[PDB]
């Protein structure tokens, strides 16, 4: 069950590149593309993300997309730069200028067909393609505009395949331009319709974690991406390694998404660590469980106590007492059963992987479909309305052929998504 | 109390003890049901592709 | 001699099928390569064990069985397992993508594109039968394949084999070993569709098996291997009468006769004893009275419930090992005066006993210890309806909000089938009430 | 930190228990349908015992014994006593009773009535109270439901001053280990106006329920004499104690009744556990011989005794299972 990876824009390619370099180490794949591991657990499901090639080298089933070559050139010169299939580098030259309209309608429309040709060539090699995963930001133009454009066209050509996304949310705490709420609201409108699963990676959360918890005075995008790549490695563990779960992108959707539009997940991770700073003391199972459920460990800046969990998936990694984990996970649901909906029996599920991530002897990844996620979209909505009520910076979009109506439509649907989440919070 | 119909063999034996006395769809019906659901899938997929065409 | 075909659907059915057929081989002295030295009738014969095994001129004894899964990983381990030579490639059918824990996807979507192939491979075996009695169908309630494709298959077999009986070995869903949040949906859906197509169904609650492995085998976190090797013993006890010389439950029709007076109420409660750990250094062998008394302990039942607060319609005791009728009658007489065993007014209060002098075979290196005598009680008690109640409640909780329903509708299923299925279960729950109280 | 649920609001007993549990600060009340509970203060009817003990990682407990209705139903109580060898027919402490189905144990009841009709014996019975069988055989049929005719004790023990009738109420608590705990404090639900043995259907001096009686509060506050006063009365008027003359018989009936149905309702090896508070109603004749009237599975308490009892329930029936971070009960040994 192969997955086709796509990474669009500056952010998408940078978190995408780190994602591959992380799991490549976990599967014993070196930058050359050669396997040098000690366990065969690493290879049993390596085909989900990697293609087997000449000399039995493993090539990532990844497609790198951008409207400017700047960031993709950095990837190619990066650590695991040469592992990628060079034909899967599809890029323009004009950029998107952090404009959703340029990525979705003008600049991106000119390049999108080239990308889909690569998507097709990769899919035809799949024994049985299960779906796509996309890495991108929502605050920019390419990953945001062209990313959602790609999603729309991928759904057209592969309507029976699962669409998964790692969508990075914009925040004033980590901002490139003021028009990020515009691009984000427009993108969310697309994600609600054309994805089955979306990991909400909030930059506001990633900043706070770096500042408050990790005590990093002035965090960079590199610091932020340590958290992303750690989370991405965690939420894909069940896909990359064999398990009781028999996990794929569809089973995840069926079990996590009780209602199709409400498919925006809160990722979490424990232990929170900074780059370079290695742990010496391992976390006890009670500590992993407590932390992974704490708001301070959530990659989406939302208070889970302000809502209810529809579903939860917790992935423990490393060698540990699976009994103790079950005792702690059952303790979780029994200590605060009020924050779990009573109308979905046994909505919290646990999985284990013997292989831990690099630098940690054990860890815990959290995937929650909470109704508290509305706080995220409400935040974007307020920032959106603040500008939109005065039609500020809108000329950047109308100059690309967009009409005000389309903004109002995107706004309304996101507000609907909020109310929809509020609906089941009072059930 | 009452043991009845005792039957012994080389592999074993069986009996019965009483303590107290007392006081489909057709083939095409199926295939139409399956095809009816398939048409509902194609309609759903058509409404999608039509919406995407817009 | 009349032949029986075993059908293993989904991961649960296949892996349990492996456990059972592994155990069958050890009991009949059949080797992994299919050679059975004790069978002096080379290339054929109409012995009791031929009910489950066909013979080739080369002296190979192959299971009258078919393995089907919508996804190849599980059956591929049978293709490359220790009993790979035992099976014929035509018997091991595999799809390319599973039902994703979705009944509708297994039944309607993917079920439609493989049902004809499966029935053709089943017909392949049926043609090798002198007089086929029927089928033994192993599956899960919670899986998309085990639930979805099973019900579809059970429908077609009733069309292609109307006169043939069909027995079920079904795995009831348990959170401790669940794989999907929607298993209550899949269970209700497959029960409703299969109910009129099943003559006798042996339900096994994974909760019960999980706790028995923890309580009696000291296995802190039972794996599927642990559960199945225990389930295989129960299945073996039930099917022993079909594979050995005897006069009780010699065919599939007799199962319905001796355990199922009312057609719809065809879910006998199974209770097995004793379950002793192999790693138990010192063990005092239990007597006929002790193991028989254990058959009325809820902690030994394949489904946790309280037979005291119900009524029996039938009860069969299946012994294996050093047992004689006298010790059995003595046990029953004692137990009756100390336990609440109420039969329905229109039934005789009695027990159909079956003994096989050969003690229960244990898998070498397994978790079970060798015992001098064991027993499996098959009692059709209304108390098993407690399992339907639990399950129907979990169904109601989710369906009230129509949670996850869109995944089923998206596969071409109608939302009405949820209510029609739940209504049939409501009727079933009441049927148990009229008989029980 | 434990959790519980409430599914019977009209119950005054566990309403106090739920209060006490919350007061410990180690028990959290959940919503009615929240399955992740440690304790269940369930409803009186249609209690779902089938859904108990199936929550992994939760030791579950309920304040009712499944099957205990056999004892707490008049029609079932008689059948239970008549069919159980432990009790059976020659039960000395249970009045002569007969299950009588309306428009069965009729034809056998008439045989009893006639022989006692002939022999000039005391021949009053009660479903209400009459000395003619035909009069209220027409009564059980004109109301519809099942009723039990029972031999009316024509010579009851009568309290002086007043020449008044009474019936004793004992509160018994059976824990998860089936330890039978008799609450040391009972109560005498007396009559206020003298009992007479001629006019029988003036139901104020024959039936001694708190309802009908509400000359109220004349002799004792609220028609409720407690053991201290009743014991003192027996010592002064009859030269005996409550322990000897009555309580030995009461402890005997309570034990005999519960040991009889133990194998049917016991949760010793079950996947869920049960406890239950019972209310045994006794009757004393002039010869100080105690008769069992009925058992109630959902009894209320006396206002004076609510605090002490309800706190007792938490100690031995709840905290015994769910421990936290001189005893008021007489343990009936068996
Ligand atoms: N006792 C036992 N139960 C099993 C086993 N394997 C799976 N199950 C149960 O089966 C349920 C899920 O059904 P599966 O058999 O795994 O899935 P499937 O039939 O292959 O259907 P899909 O994979 O969804 O297409 C879960 O509740 C498991 O507890 C097993 O080996 N032994
Ligand atoms: N055989 C008998 N002889 C004399 N009096 C009797 C009797 N049976 C019942 N009584 C009287 O009947 C009244 C109680 O009847 P019963 O106990 O059946 O009602 P009840 O249980 O619904 C009220 P509570 O719920 O408090 O027990 C008492 O006043 C008792 O004295
Ligand atoms: N976490 C993270 N966020 C980024 C990174 N680069 C840009 N972003 C976010 O994405 C938005 C800018 O989008 P960008 O990816 O640069 O636009 P694009 O290249 O045109 O698709 C802002 O909201 C940034 O916070 C990165 O490396 N890491
Ligand atoms: C909510 O309860 C459940 C029940 C079943 C489930 N399966 C899965 C997955 O397949 C999966 C895929 C990728 C990453 C993590 C998990 C999640 C899940 C949650
Ligand atoms: Mg940028
Ligand atoms: Mg499967
Ligand atoms: Mg032969």
PDB file of N, CA and C in Angstrom, chain A residues 347-410:
ATOM      1  N   UNK A 347     -13.230   5.461  22.017  1.00  0.00           N
ATOM      2  CA  UNK A 347     -12.736   6.347  20.971  1.00  0.00           C
ATOM      3  C   UNK A 347     -11.247   6.656  21.101  1.00  0.00           C
ATOM      4  N   UNK A 348     -10.605   6.079  22.115  1.00  0.00           N
ATOM      5  CA  UNK A 348      -9.168   6.243  22.322  1.00  0.00           C
ATOM      6  C   UNK A 348      -8.451   4.920  22.094  1.00  0.00           C
ATOM      7  N   UNK A 349      -7.533   4.901  21.132  1.00  0.00           N
ATOM      8  CA  UNK A 349      -6.811   3.682  20.789  1.00  0.00           C
ATOM      9  C   UNK A 349      -5.307   3.868  20.882  1.00  0.00           C
ATOM     10  N   UNK A 350      -4.632   2.787  21.259  1.00  0.00           N
ATOM     11  CA  UNK A 350      -3.198   2.799  21.493  1.00  0.00           C
ATOM     12  C   UNK A 350      -2.479   1.836  20.556  1.00  0.00           C
ATOM     13  N   UNK A 351      -1.279   2.223  20.143  1.00  0.00           N
ATOM     14  CA  UNK A 351      -0.425   1.381  19.318  1.00  0.00           C
ATOM     15  C   UNK A 351       1.008   1.477  19.820  1.00  0.00           C
ATOM     16  N   UNK A 352       1.807   0.457  19.523  1.00  0.00           N
ATOM     17  CA  UNK A 352       3.193   0.403  19.972  1.00  0.00           C
ATOM     18  C   UNK A 352       4.142   0.077  18.823  1.00  0.00           C
ATOM     19  N   UNK A 353       5.344   0.636  18.893  1.00  0.00           N
ATOM     20  CA  UNK A 353       6.407   0.322  17.949  1.00  0.00           C
ATOM     21  C   UNK A 353       7.713   0.135  18.712  1.00  0.00           C
ATOM     22  N   UNK A 354       8.360  -1.007  18.511  1.00  0.00           N
ATOM     23  CA  UNK A 354       9.580  -1.328  19.242  1.00  0.00           C
ATOM     24  C   UNK A 354      10.708  -0.362  18.906  1.00  0.00           C
ATOM     25  N   UNK A 355      10.722   0.122  17.670  1.00  0.00           N
ATOM     26  CA  UNK A 355      11.748   1.055  17.224  1.00  0.00           C
ATOM     27  C   UNK A 355      11.424   2.467  17.701  1.00  0.00           C
ATOM     28  N   UNK A 356      12.308   3.063  18.520  1.00  0.00           N
ATOM     29  CA  UNK A 356      12.094   4.456  18.910  1.00  0.00           C
ATOM     30  C   UNK A 356      12.756   5.413  17.929  1.00  0.00           C
ATOM     31  N   UNK A 357      12.385   6.699  17.973  1.00  0.00           N
ATOM     32  CA  UNK A 357      13.075   7.681  17.132  1.00  0.00           C
ATOM     33  C   UNK A 357      14.521   7.892  17.578  1.00  0.00           C
ATOM     34  N   UNK A 358      15.343   8.474  16.712  1.00  0.00           N
ATOM     35  CA  UNK A 358      16.743   8.728  17.035  1.00  0.00           C
ATOM     36  C   UNK A 358      16.860   9.718  18.186  1.00  0.00           C
ATOM     37  N   UNK A 359      17.725   9.404  19.146  1.00  0.00           N
ATOM     38  CA  UNK A 359      17.999  10.301  20.254  1.00  0.00           C
ATOM     39  C   UNK A 359      17.093  10.081  21.448  1.00  0.00           C
ATOM     40  N   UNK A 360      16.106   9.207  21.287  1.00  0.00           N
ATOM     41  CA  UNK A 360      15.169   8.896  22.358  1.00  0.00           C
ATOM     42  C   UNK A 360      15.019   7.390  22.492  1.00  0.00           C
ATOM     43  N   UNK A 361      15.044   6.902  23.727  1.00  0.00           N
ATOM     44  CA  UNK A 361      14.881   5.477  23.980  1.00  0.00           C
ATOM     45  C   UNK A 361      13.403   5.110  23.998  1.00  0.00           C
ATOM     46  N   UNK A 362      12.551   6.107  24.215  1.00  0.00           N
ATOM     47  CA  UNK A 362      11.118   5.912  24.064  1.00  0.00           C
ATOM     48  C   UNK A 362      10.392   7.243  23.940  1.00  0.00           C
ATOM     49  N   UNK A 363       9.270   7.225  23.227  1.00  0.00           N
ATOM     50  CA  UNK A 363       8.498   8.434  22.977  1.00  0.00           C
ATOM     51  C   UNK A 363       7.025   8.113  22.784  1.00  0.00           C
ATOM     52  N   UNK A 364       6.207   9.159  22.745  1.00  0.00           N
ATOM     53  CA  UNK A 364       4.769   9.015  22.567  1.00  0.00           C
ATOM     54  C   UNK A 364       4.231  10.105  21.646  1.00  0.00           C
ATOM     55  N   UNK A 365       3.556   9.690  20.579  1.00  0.00           N
ATOM     56  CA  UNK A 365       2.944  10.621  19.637  1.00  0.00           C
ATOM     57  C   UNK A 365       1.427  10.624  19.803  1.00  0.00           C
ATOM     58  N   UNK A 366       0.842  11.816  19.753  1.00  0.00           N
ATOM     59  CA  UNK A 366      -0.583  12.001  19.987  1.00  0.00           C
ATOM     60  C   UNK A 366      -1.292  12.499  18.729  1.00  0.00           C
ATOM     61  N   UNK A 367      -2.445  11.907  18.430  1.00  0.00           N
ATOM     62  CA  UNK A 367      -3.294  12.350  17.326  1.00  0.00           C
ATOM     63  C   UNK A 367      -4.731  12.453  17.813  1.00  0.00           C
ATOM     64  N   UNK A 368      -5.182  13.677  18.054  1.00  0.00           N
ATOM     65  CA  UNK A 368      -6.506  13.910  18.592  1.00  0.00           C
ATOM     66  C   UNK A 368      -7.382  14.716  17.657  1.00  0.00           C
ATOM     67  N   UNK A 369      -8.594  14.221  17.437  1.00  0.00           N
ATOM     68  CA  UNK A 369      -9.630  14.979  16.753  1.00  0.00           C
ATOM     69  C   UNK A 369     -10.516  15.652  17.800  1.00  0.00           C
ATOM     70  N   UNK A 370     -10.032  16.762  18.347  1.00  0.00           N
ATOM     71  CA  UNK A 370     -10.759  17.505  19.373  1.00  0.00           C
ATOM     72  C   UNK A 370     -11.639  18.591  18.769  1.00  0.00           C
ATOM     73  N   UNK A 371     -12.739  18.901  19.448  1.00  0.00           N
ATOM     74  CA  UNK A 371     -13.596  20.013  19.049  1.00  0.00           C
ATOM     75  C   UNK A 371     -12.962  21.348  19.436  1.00  0.00           C
ATOM     76  N   UNK A 372     -11.902  21.292  20.236  1.00  0.00           N
ATOM     77  CA  UNK A 372     -11.195  22.496  20.653  1.00  0.00           C
ATOM     78  C   UNK A 372     -10.379  23.087  19.508  1.00  0.00           C
ATOM     79  N   UNK A 373     -10.289  22.361  18.399  1.00  0.00           N
ATOM     80  CA  UNK A 373      -9.524  22.819  17.245  1.00  0.00           C
ATOM     81  C   UNK A 373     -10.167  24.066  16.637  1.00  0.00           C
ATOM     82  N   UNK A 374     -11.441  24.282  16.949  1.00  0.00           N
ATOM     83  CA  UNK A 374     -12.161  25.451  16.462  1.00  0.00           C
ATOM     84  C   UNK A 374     -11.478  26.742  16.896  1.00  0.00           C
ATOM     85  N   UNK A 375     -10.791  26.700  18.031  1.00  0.00           N
ATOM     86  CA  UNK A 375     -10.074  27.865  18.530  1.00  0.00           C
ATOM     87  C   UNK A 375      -9.048  28.323  17.506  1.00  0.00           C
ATOM     88  N   UNK A 376      -8.490  27.365  16.779  1.00  0.00           N
ATOM     89  CA  UNK A 376      -7.494  27.653  15.758  1.00  0.00           C
ATOM     90  C   UNK A 376      -8.116  28.408  14.594  1.00  0.00           C
ATOM     91  N   UNK A 377      -9.263  27.928  14.129  1.00  0.00           N
ATOM     92  CA  UNK A 377      -9.923  28.515  12.974  1.00  0.00           C
ATOM     93  C   UNK A 377     -10.593  29.833  13.335  1.00  0.00           C
ATOM     94  N   UNK A 378     -11.082  29.934  14.567  1.00  0.00           N
ATOM     95  CA  UNK A 378     -11.643  31.187  15.059  1.00  0.00           C
ATOM     96  C   UNK A 378     -10.564  32.258  15.102  1.00  0.00           C
ATOM     97  N   UNK A 379      -9.354  31.856  15.471  1.00  0.00           N
ATOM     98  CA  UNK A 379      -8.229  32.777  15.529  1.00  0.00           C
ATOM     99  C   UNK A 379      -7.927  33.336  14.143  1.00  0.00           C
ATOM    100  N   UNK A 380      -7.814  32.444  13.164  1.00  0.00           N
ATOM    101  CA  UNK A 380      -7.583  32.839  11.780  1.00  0.00           C
ATOM    102  C   UNK A 380      -8.729  33.712  11.283  1.00  0.00           C
ATOM    103  N   UNK A 381      -9.947  33.389  11.706  1.00  0.00           N
ATOM    104  CA  UNK A 381     -11.127  34.104  11.242  1.00  0.00           C
ATOM    105  C   UNK A 381     -11.133  35.547  11.731  1.00  0.00           C
ATOM    106  N   UNK A 382     -10.702  35.752  12.970  1.00  0.00           N
ATOM    107  CA  UNK A 382     -10.642  37.090  13.538  1.00  0.00           C
ATOM    108  C   UNK A 382      -9.601  37.930  12.809  1.00  0.00           C
ATOM    109  N   UNK A 383      -8.422  37.354  12.598  1.00  0.00           N
ATOM    110  CA  UNK A 383      -7.353  38.039  11.882  1.00  0.00           C
ATOM    111  C   UNK A 383      -7.769  38.353  10.450  1.00  0.00           C
ATOM    112  N   UNK A 384      -8.582  37.468   9.883  1.00  0.00           N
ATOM    113  CA  UNK A 384      -9.118  37.632   8.541  1.00  0.00           C
ATOM    114  C   UNK A 384     -10.091  38.804   8.489  1.00  0.00           C
ATOM    115  N   UNK A 385     -11.072  38.779   9.386  1.00  0.00           N
ATOM    116  CA  UNK A 385     -12.133  39.777   9.411  1.00  0.00           C
ATOM    117  C   UNK A 385     -11.590  41.173   9.687  1.00  0.00           C
ATOM    118  N   UNK A 386     -10.542  41.249  10.500  1.00  0.00           N
ATOM    119  CA  UNK A 386      -9.952  42.526  10.874  1.00  0.00           C
ATOM    120  C   UNK A 386      -9.500  43.299   9.643  1.00  0.00           C
ATOM    121  N   UNK A 387      -8.949  42.581   8.673  1.00  0.00           N
ATOM    122  CA  UNK A 387      -8.478  43.194   7.442  1.00  0.00           C
ATOM    123  C   UNK A 387      -9.605  43.283   6.426  1.00  0.00           C
ATOM    124  N   UNK A 388     -10.409  42.229   6.355  1.00  0.00           N
ATOM    125  CA  UNK A 388     -11.398  42.089   5.293  1.00  0.00           C
ATOM    126  C   UNK A 388     -12.534  43.094   5.421  1.00  0.00           C
ATOM    127  N   UNK A 389     -12.798  43.547   6.641  1.00  0.00           N
ATOM    128  CA  UNK A 389     -13.861  44.517   6.874  1.00  0.00           C
ATOM    129  C   UNK A 389     -13.509  45.866   6.243  1.00  0.00           C
ATOM    130  N   UNK A 390     -12.220  46.070   5.982  1.00  0.00           N
ATOM    131  CA  UNK A 390     -11.728  47.271   5.311  1.00  0.00           C
ATOM    132  C   UNK A 390     -11.154  46.931   3.939  1.00  0.00           C
ATOM    133  N   UNK A 391     -11.293  45.672   3.535  1.00  0.00           N
ATOM    134  CA  UNK A 391     -10.811  45.208   2.237  1.00  0.00           C
ATOM    135  C   UNK A 391      -9.322  45.484   2.061  1.00  0.00           C
ATOM    136  N   UNK A 392      -8.572  45.382   3.152  1.00  0.00           N
ATOM    137  CA  UNK A 392      -7.157  45.729   3.145  1.00  0.00           C
ATOM    138  C   UNK A 392      -6.322  44.673   2.433  1.00  0.00           C
ATOM    139  N   UNK A 393      -5.329  45.131   1.673  1.00  0.00           N
ATOM    140  CA  UNK A 393      -4.394  44.255   0.967  1.00  0.00           C
ATOM    141  C   UNK A 393      -5.081  43.352  -0.048  1.00  0.00           C
ATOM    142  N   UNK A 394      -6.338  43.648  -0.349  1.00  0.00           N
ATOM    143  CA  UNK A 394      -7.133  42.801  -1.223  1.00  0.00           C
ATOM    144  C   UNK A 394      -6.759  43.000  -2.691  1.00  0.00           C
ATOM    145  N   UNK A 395      -6.118  44.124  -2.996  1.00  0.00           N
ATOM    146  CA  UNK A 395      -5.751  44.440  -4.370  1.00  0.00           C
ATOM    147  C   UNK A 395      -4.715  43.454  -4.904  1.00  0.00           C
ATOM    148  N   UNK A 396      -3.975  42.814  -4.002  1.00  0.00           N
ATOM    149  CA  UNK A 396      -3.003  41.799  -4.399  1.00  0.00           C
ATOM    150  C   UNK A 396      -3.703  40.599  -5.028  1.00  0.00           C
ATOM    151  N   UNK A 397      -4.946  40.371  -4.621  1.00  0.00           N
ATOM    152  CA  UNK A 397      -5.704  39.207  -5.061  1.00  0.00           C
ATOM    153  C   UNK A 397      -6.592  39.528  -6.254  1.00  0.00           C
ATOM    154  N   UNK A 398      -7.289  40.655  -6.192  1.00  0.00           N
ATOM    155  CA  UNK A 398      -8.141  41.062  -7.299  1.00  0.00           C
ATOM    156  C   UNK A 398      -7.287  41.326  -8.536  1.00  0.00           C
ATOM    157  N   UNK A 399      -6.030  41.697  -8.318  1.00  0.00           N
ATOM    158  CA  UNK A 399      -5.094  41.885  -9.410  1.00  0.00           C
ATOM    159  C   UNK A 399      -4.791  40.581 -10.121  1.00  0.00           C
ATOM    160  N   UNK A 400      -5.101  39.469  -9.461  1.00  0.00           N
ATOM    161  CA  UNK A 400      -4.920  38.142 -10.036  1.00  0.00           C
ATOM    162  C   UNK A 400      -6.253  37.542 -10.486  1.00  0.00           C
ATOM    163  N   UNK A 401      -7.299  38.364 -10.504  1.00  0.00           N
ATOM    164  CA  UNK A 401      -8.580  37.972 -11.064  1.00  0.00           C
ATOM    165  C   UNK A 401      -9.624  37.551 -10.048  1.00  0.00           C
ATOM    166  N   UNK A 402      -9.256  37.553  -8.770  1.00  0.00           N
ATOM    167  CA  UNK A 402     -10.167  37.123  -7.718  1.00  0.00           C
ATOM    168  C   UNK A 402     -11.201  38.190  -7.389  1.00  0.00           C
ATOM    169  N   UNK A 403     -12.363  37.741  -6.924  1.00  0.00           N
ATOM    170  CA  UNK A 403     -13.443  38.631  -6.521  1.00  0.00           C
ATOM    171  C   UNK A 403     -13.653  38.544  -5.017  1.00  0.00           C
ATOM    172  N   UNK A 404     -14.197  39.610  -4.438  1.00  0.00           N
ATOM    173  CA  UNK A 404     -14.443  39.670  -3.004  1.00  0.00           C
ATOM    174  C   UNK A 404     -15.364  38.547  -2.546  1.00  0.00           C
ATOM    175  N   UNK A 405     -16.269  38.132  -3.427  1.00  0.00           N
ATOM    176  CA  UNK A 405     -17.249  37.108  -3.095  1.00  0.00           C
ATOM    177  C   UNK A 405     -16.562  35.823  -2.651  1.00  0.00           C
ATOM    178  N   UNK A 406     -15.460  35.490  -3.311  1.00  0.00           N
ATOM    179  CA  UNK A 406     -14.742  34.259  -3.018  1.00  0.00           C
ATOM    180  C   UNK A 406     -14.147  34.273  -1.614  1.00  0.00           C
ATOM    181  N   UNK A 407     -13.739  35.452  -1.155  1.00  0.00           N
ATOM    182  CA  UNK A 407     -13.257  35.621   0.211  1.00  0.00           C
ATOM    183  C   UNK A 407     -14.393  35.410   1.197  1.00  0.00           C
ATOM    184  N   UNK A 408     -15.536  36.023   0.910  1.00  0.00           N
ATOM    185  CA  UNK A 408     -16.702  35.913   1.777  1.00  0.00           C
ATOM    186  C   UNK A 408     -17.176  34.466   1.866  1.00  0.00           C
ATOM    187  N   UNK A 409     -17.052  33.734   0.765  1.00  0.00           N
ATOM    188  CA  UNK A 409     -17.440  32.332   0.736  1.00  0.00           C
ATOM    189  C   UNK A 409     -16.506  31.486   1.587  1.00  0.00           C
ATOM    190  N   UNK A 410     -15.207  31.734   1.456  1.00  0.00           N
ATOM    191  CA  UNK A 410     -14.211  31.004   2.225  1.00  0.00           C
ATOM    192  C   UNK A 410     -14.375  31.304   3.711  1.00  0.00           C
TER     193      UNK A 410
END
